[PDB]
Amino acid sequence: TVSRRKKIAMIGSGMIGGTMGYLCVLRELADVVLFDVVTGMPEGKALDDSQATSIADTNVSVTSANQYEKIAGSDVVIITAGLTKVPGKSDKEWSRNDLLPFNAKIIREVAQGVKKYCPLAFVIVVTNPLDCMVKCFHEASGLPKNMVCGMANVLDSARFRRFIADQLEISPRDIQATVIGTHGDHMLPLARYVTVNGFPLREFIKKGKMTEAKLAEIVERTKKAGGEIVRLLGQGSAYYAPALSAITMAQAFLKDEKRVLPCSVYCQGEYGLHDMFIGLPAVIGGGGIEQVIELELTHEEQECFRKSVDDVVELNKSLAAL
Amino acid sequence: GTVSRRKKIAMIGSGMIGGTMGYLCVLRELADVVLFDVVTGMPEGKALDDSQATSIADTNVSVTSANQYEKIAGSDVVIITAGLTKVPGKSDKEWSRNDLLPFNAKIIREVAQGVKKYCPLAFVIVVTNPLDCMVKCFHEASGLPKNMVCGMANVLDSARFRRFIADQLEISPRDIQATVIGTHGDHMLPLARYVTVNGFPLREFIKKGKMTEAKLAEIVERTKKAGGEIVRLLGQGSAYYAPALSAITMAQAFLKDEKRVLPCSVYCQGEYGLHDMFIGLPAVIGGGGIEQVIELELTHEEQECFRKSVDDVVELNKSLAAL
Amino acid sequence: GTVSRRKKIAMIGSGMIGGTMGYLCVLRELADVVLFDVVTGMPEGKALDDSQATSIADTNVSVTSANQYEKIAGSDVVIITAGLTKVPGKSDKEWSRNDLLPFNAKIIREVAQGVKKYCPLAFVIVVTNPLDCMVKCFHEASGLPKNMVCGMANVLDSARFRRFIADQLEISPRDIQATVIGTHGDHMLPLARYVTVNGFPLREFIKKGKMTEAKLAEIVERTKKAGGEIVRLLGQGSAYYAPALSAITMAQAFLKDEKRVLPCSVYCQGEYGLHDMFIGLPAVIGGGGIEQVIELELTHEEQECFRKSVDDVVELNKSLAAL
Amino acid sequence: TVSRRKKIAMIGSGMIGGTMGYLCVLRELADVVLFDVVTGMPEGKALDDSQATSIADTNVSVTSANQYEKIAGSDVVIITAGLTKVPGKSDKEWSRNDLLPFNAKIIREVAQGVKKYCPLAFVIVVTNPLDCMVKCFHEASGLPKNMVCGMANVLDSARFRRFIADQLEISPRDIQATVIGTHGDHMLPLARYVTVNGFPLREFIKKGKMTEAKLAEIVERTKKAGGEIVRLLGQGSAYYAPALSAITMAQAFLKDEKRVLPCSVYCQGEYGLHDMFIGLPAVIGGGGIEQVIELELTHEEQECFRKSVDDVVELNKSLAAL
Ligand SMILES: NC(=O)c1ccc[n+]([C@@H]2O[C@H](COP(=O)([O-])OP(=O)(O)OC[C@H]3O[C@@H](n4cnc5c(N)ncnc54)[C@H](O)[C@@H]3O)[C@@H](O)[C@H]2O)c1
Ligand SMILES: NC(=O)c1ccc[n+]([C@@H]2O[C@H](COP(=O)([O-])OP(=O)(O)OC[C@H]3O[C@@H](n4cnc5c(N)ncnc54)[C@H](O)[C@@H]3O)[C@@H](O)[C@H]2O)c1
Numbered sequence A, D: 001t002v003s004r005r006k007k008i009a010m011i012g013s014g015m016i017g018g019t020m021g022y023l024c025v026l027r028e029l030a031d032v033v034l035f036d037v038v039t040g041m042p043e044g045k046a047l048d049d050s051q052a053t054s055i056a057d058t059n060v061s062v063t064s065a066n067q068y069e070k071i072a073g074s075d076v077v078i079i080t081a082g083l084t085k086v087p088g089k090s091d092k093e094w095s096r097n098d099l100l101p102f103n104a105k106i107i108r109e110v111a112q113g114v115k116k117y118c119p120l121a122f123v124i125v126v127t128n129p130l131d132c133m134v135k136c137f138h139e140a141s142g143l144p145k146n147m148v149c150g151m152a153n154v155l156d157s158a159r160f161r162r163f164i165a166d167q168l169e170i171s172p173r174d175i176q177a178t179v180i181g182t183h184g185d186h187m188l189p190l191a192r193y194v195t196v197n198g199f200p201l202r203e204f205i206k207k208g209k210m211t212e213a214k215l216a217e218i219v220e221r222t223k224k225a226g227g228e229i230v231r232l233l234g235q236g237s238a239y240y241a242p243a244l245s246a247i248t249m250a251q252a253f254l255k256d257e258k259r260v261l262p263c264s265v266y267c268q269g270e271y272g273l274h275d276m277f278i279g280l281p282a283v284i285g286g287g288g289i290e291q292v293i294e295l296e297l298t299h300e301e302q303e304c305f306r307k308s309v310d311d312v313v314e315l316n317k318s319l320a321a322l
Numbered sequence B, C: 001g002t003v004s005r006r007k008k009i010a011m012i013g014s015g016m017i018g019g020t021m022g023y024l025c026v027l028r029e030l031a032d033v034v035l036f037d038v039v040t041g042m043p044e045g046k047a048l049d050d051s052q053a054t055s056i057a058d059t060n061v062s063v064t065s066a067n068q069y070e071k072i073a074g075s076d077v078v079i080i081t082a083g084l085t086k087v088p089g090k091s092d093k094e095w096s097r098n099d100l101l102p103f104n105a106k107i108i109r110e111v112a113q114g115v116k117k118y119c120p121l122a123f124v125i126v127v128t129n130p131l132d133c134m135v136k137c138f139h140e141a142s143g144l145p146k147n148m149v150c151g152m153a154n155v156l157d158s159a160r161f162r163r164f165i166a167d168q169l170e171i172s173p174r175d176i177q178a179t180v181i182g183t184h185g186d187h188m189l190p191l192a193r194y195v196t197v198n199g200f201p202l203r204e205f206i207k208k209g210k211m212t213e214a215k216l217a218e219i220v221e222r223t224k225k226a227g228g229e230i231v232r233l234l235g236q237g238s239a240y241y242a243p244a245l246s247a248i249t250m251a252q253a254f255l256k257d258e259k260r261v262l263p264c265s266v267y268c269q270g271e272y273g274l275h276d277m278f279i280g281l282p283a284v285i286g287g288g289g290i291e292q293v294i295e296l297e298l299t300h301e302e303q304e305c306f307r308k309s310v311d312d313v314v315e316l317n318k319s320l321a322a323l
């Protein structure tokens, strides 16, 4: 075989892992390995997803595994391995930060597997607490700084954009709305940078297409979106938009698209941040994280951002203290 | 002042398959979506998740949830997945689509009243098991035209048949034409004789050593057991990815009048000598609904098998009337 | 008995752009296609070529040719490319869209009568140059609603603006929002101040050294001269690939009610203080046709430029009445 | 750049070359190099096609060239370089065989360029007389037998399928109709192998959905399709379906799809043919031509096939005698 297919390993074959494998089948993006510690269920997802290639009229290989040697040769690795909720807690008390002691353990295990079998892969961490887990994976795996990132802000921005799109009655394709920062209650939806095909939202508000109170409400909804879905589902958390967000990132790498997709990235001076990962606008291409966009935040915005930073910083301190 | 309105598909049942189909509509920007279910909460969680996905897919369709049939009014297509997947008490090995009869007949008749009242002009695709029995139940309970009601099953069965063959021949499933007809159950009939590689009979490939007769037979058996295998491996519910895509592919064939050949459970009126019943047959789906029902020249042997398939639907239909 | 009919797009003019748009309809299975032209023979050659392509694309739409307006009846959308691309006698360097006025005004008025008679309910997209002048000419000659007629131009101009910026910043054009408004000609206005990278002002990228002001200006000039450069390089006719995609993108926004922001020549009724004329402005295209006309808070400087753009269309419209 | 984009070189940037570059832009299939001996026009096509990426929201590089070093690193090379008609002749007398003395020269030039700058590419010859030209390119370039093929039968089959699809009122996706043999008047539309999703056409005829006379007519139309389009266009020949046919082949290689796409391939015993290229059913994947399907032709079919073979054989004799 002179021209081999792209290969993506889904470390974690739950709701998101399986849905991402499905997206690969639909777009014929790459061969898929549905890895997981659970036996049985992954083979079931693998069979379901592979059988879908017939109807999709595409041809990629979807298999399951529980041995890390199976992910060797992966171009991309998307990690969803972990718990979605704390055993016992109610949905009313769902908190991403509480998954720390449970998932760090899992992420470290995965890091060792990747370091050993596919150290040249581009890694996309999904597992929560996202920003903390990406840093955890980076340290444990030893992979280059530009080849590791966490999917979060693309999802947050998707919500931000959809809400605005509904109000303005314009397609979300033409709404540029970005959320940066830690993926949690202190994420920062950049209201001042929201544009309609480049045109500042401020101009649409001055014309009565949206009220300042509605924008504020949309900014709040964006932050609460994840918990809202957790509350409404009853079982687990969001997986459709999250799966597409991660795959969109994977494709940007695979096809060297150079798409601007906000994701938790390694900081070396940007925004005055050092030795940590946090959500920021970035460009993803064949070189991994090729650009970290440094925006000129206002003082008011810097305060909000600093609080968002405190969250990861304390989260990372708790991680170390274990 | 909208002159050009988007297509609308109501998903009656917002479980694993319903939500996945809504996701598909988002990705292809196929149609606005209504995720209907008797359960409140979950559907809206699905609607939010799927609608938020439009942003990343850069498409624009509306995805909302509902628990009131008035919401499905105007739907161009209705795909029904409402129903149980497994019978409480039964082991995974004991899983049988037929045991679902007394639980889902009730549900399908309710849905029938809802469609009859709010969107009687829709093209209806039943998915709920026992499929062939449920489609017939929906059709008589709803009163919709015979060419506007069908059941999704054989597209899924054929997909498996095709994927298995494709793997063995090292050829894309796009170029494997393998068809399964009959009742969606243990007596479904994978038409081994009609398997082709871009029109070239499989037997020529076998004669040339590409694969053996024994493997063909192994694959035929595997096709029949595919559902239960996944039920066993998942440990919860049943398949939904391929099922959702099968149904949406049929829905799209209708919406865009593609005239695709997609085997599904259809109303019989003389084909293969059958009357007043639904069963899997190769059909052509287009803007006119089920536009053609292909009647294949089956051999006596295949007829023997097909009759066992019919016996099953006939029995189920009897068990239904016996309620 | 077809309940769900495919969309229908009539291509008035089956030259380079018309045929390419039909090709696009085939690939996306967007709609049935009618390749209309006064010339006989060539259009049918295009129809055969494009229809045969459906097989390889595995899609199913109808592509036919015509020379009689009765054939475009029922069209949901009409894209007009009928007209000359260059003036015989003129050198390539002398190429100017304005010189096409006396040759295409005649053609556009004929097409107007055809649409008025056979498919007056269509969403019409004019492409023929001089664009802004031709769209206005079509609108008054046809009598169609003001929200159902527009001209494709600025989407193409913006595409160039975006591609140039994208190359310099090493970012996909998907994430570059660069817009051009005004008359489709040497006085078009690439809005440098409104150029963003996913909403982030370009000036921040310039301030950080990613690219210089001089390059921005070089690109602004390049955007204006793009058409003539291609005319010069091709040596025959003018651009058609990006043009065809620009028009089909607008057509799709209408057909599937996507509500996309696509700058195009639209009917003015007070925006920027303009009345009874068409000119390029950012607009929102959906199922209601031109659903929104965005009026940007232009600075005096940008207003000065925009006024020169308006002066051009006003002059052309005068030259037209003077016929 | 860890993950580089696929690269396709269009040797010949005329109607087909440009249209293929356009398809790459639409599908984001690969970066495109529009090569040609003509200067000016290719840069115009390159600009037009690249500008289309913005509207398509894709990101690939489309450039032009007239120096072979520019095609270095190409994964695929599609050759359309050549004349479409004999200078002076009327459209009434159009014949693919007459382009021989004009295009062999051109194909040999291209062979030297490919051999030198991208010998590891998968080559798809389009230039006519197709079957003769593929053999000409193979001999001159020295590329492996499985990495060189000629696009023709996919186009012929597309016509065959479309005509049948219209009559049966079924999508061409579900019509399997194949044409094999030399791309010319003696091409062989395999009427006995036409199926509707695997179901023999014979069964649809017995049911009155199509008449035997209509099938015969469709078989004739298929052979005459190319000349018909030449007659109707006035300028050149077909390019839309031809461009999609070649790109579909290129994609099958690039993404290792293993699609059954009839194309002129190297024969080593198949159908009793030796040292020549001719249209036959084949599977295209990452290994190039991975399979040559040998069908059990009836005696009647073998006669027709042998005449089709005679055509290339004599064509190849004329090539040698130059
Ligand atoms: N960043 C974001 O925006 C975002 C969005 C949604 C969910 N998430 C997070 O994604 C994660 C997965 O969500 P989900 O819905 O797919 O959950 P899920 O429970 O459906 O799947 C998680 C899977 O991880 C597997 N797993 C556990 N330990 C493992 C190990 N050591 N190795 C391999 N696999 C292991 C489990 O068996 C399970 O199948 C959660 O931690 C969730 O909080 C993040
Ligand atoms: N034909 C086929 O090939 C095929 C393939 C897979 C599954 N199925 C069948 O499809 C059905 C759905 O499968 P699933 O995986 O989505 O199951 P699921 O359990 O995930 O979802 C079924 C949904 O139906 C809803 N429901 C129940 N009663 C209802 C009512 N009266 N009105 C509206 N909604 C109601 C439930 O609340 C639930 O959300 C099952 O019966 C299954 O056996 C058929």
Ligand SMILES: NC(=O)c1ccc[n+]([C@@H]2O[C@H](COP(=O)([O-])OP(=O)(O)OC[C@H]3O[C@@H](n4cnc5c(N)ncnc54)[C@H](O)[C@@H]3O)[C@@H](O)[C@H]2O)c1
Residues within 6 Å of the ligand: C012, C013, C014, C015, C016, C017, C018, C036, C037, C038, C039, C081, C082, C083, C084, C085, C086, C100, C104, C107, C110, C111, C126, C127, C128, C129, C131, C152, C153, C154, C156, C184, C237, C238, C239, C240, C243
């Ligand atoms: N708005 C833009 O941005 C833009 C971009 C490119 C080209 N254009 C303009 O688009 C037009 C078409 O460009 P093209 O490349 O397709 O040109 P073309 O010469 O290839 O095709 C124009 C076609 O119009 C046909 N035609 C002439 N009179 C007609 C009539 N009365 N009825 C029906 N058809 C008639 C011709 O026979 C010819 O086939 C030109 O006027 C060109 O200047 C505009």
Ligand SMILES: NC(=O)c1ccc[n+]([C@@H]2O[C@H](COP(=O)([O-])OP(=O)(O)OC[C@H]3O[C@@H](n4cnc5c(N)ncnc54)[C@H](O)[C@@H]3O)[C@@H](O)[C@H]2O)c1
Residues within 6 Å of the ligand: D011, D012, D013, D014, D015, D016, D017, D035, D036, D037, D038, D080, D081, D082, D083, D084, D085, D099, D103, D106, D109, D126, D127, D128, D130, D151, D152, D153, D155, D183, D236, D237, D238, D239, D242
């Ligand atoms: N196999 C098939 O099914 C099929 C179908 C259609 C056309 N064709 C053949 O494809 C070829 C191209 O068709 P087209 O419509 O694109 O023609 P075209 O005239 O539009 O383009 C051919 C291009 O080849 C270029 N060229 C000439 N000599 C060259 C050289 N030495 N190096 C590089 N480029 C050179 C020309 O400058 C011209 O731009 C013709 O020979 C035609 O007969 C084959």
Ligand SMILES: O=C(O)c1nonc1O
Residues within 6 Å of the ligand: A084, A096, A128, A155, A183, A225, A226, A227, A229, A237, A238
């Ligand atoms: O943000 C979400 O929707 C989410 N769901 O599970 N984890 C998350 O971060």
Ligand SMILES: O=C(O)c1nonc1O
Residues within 6 Å of the ligand: B085, B097, B129, B156, B184, B226, B227, B228, B230, B238, B239
């Ligand atoms: O066929 C299947 O996979 C299936 N799963 O649930 N019902 C079915 O028919």
Ligand SMILES: O=C(O)c1nonc1O
Residues within 6 Å of the ligand: C085, C097, C129, C156, C184, C226, C227, C228, C230, C238, C239
């Ligand atoms: O802008 C162009 O490229 C163009 N080509 O022909 N007319 C035009 O406006």
Ligand SMILES: O=C(O)c1nonc1O
Residues within 6 Å of the ligand: D084, D096, D128, D155, D183, D225, D226, D227, D229, D237, D238
């Ligand atoms: O077959 C065709 O259409 C053709 N057109 O130009 N050369 C050919 O072979």
